[PDB]
Amino acid sequence: ADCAQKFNGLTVLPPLLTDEMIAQYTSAL
Amino acid sequence: LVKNKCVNFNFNGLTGTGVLTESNKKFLPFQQFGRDIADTTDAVRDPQT
Numbered sequence: 001a002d003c004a005q006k007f008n009g010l011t012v013l014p015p016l017l018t019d020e021m022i023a024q025y026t027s028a029l
Numbered sequence: 030l031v032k033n034k035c036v037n038f039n040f041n042g043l044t045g046t047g048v049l050t051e052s053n054k055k056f057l058p059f060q061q062f063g064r065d066i067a068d069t070t071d072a073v074r075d076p077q078t
């Protein structure tokens with residue numbers, strides 16, 4: 001469900017491992 | 030009126046701090062403020078223009 005973006009000082013920080021990177025690990029295993 | 034710079038604004042007795050830009054959305058004639066799902070004003074209609 002759907003600039004820091006969020007008026008009340010709410011921010012979402014991106015994960016260290018991107019979605020593409022996680023798939024690569026899955027492919028490797 | 031100012032666009033594309035962060036500014037303190039009051040529109041018809043509504044006060045917010047934000048960056049103002051033109052939008053595609055078309056308001057209903059009678060309504061003036063716009064509000065999102067989380068009840069934060071997302072759009073405003075200037076009375077003058």
Ligand SMILES: *[C@H]1O[C@H](CO)[C@@H](O[C@@H]2O[C@H](CO)[C@@H](O)[C@H](O)[C@H]2NC(C)=O)[C@H](O)[C@H]1NC(C)=O
Pocket residue numbers: 076077078
């Ligand atoms: C209120 O006055 C403003 C400013 O004179 C009007 O705005 C103008 O409207 C004319 C005709 O629509 C436009 O051609 C102009 O470009 C507009 N700006 C100016 C500065 O003249 C407005 O129409 C008037 N009436 C309202 C909002 O009811």
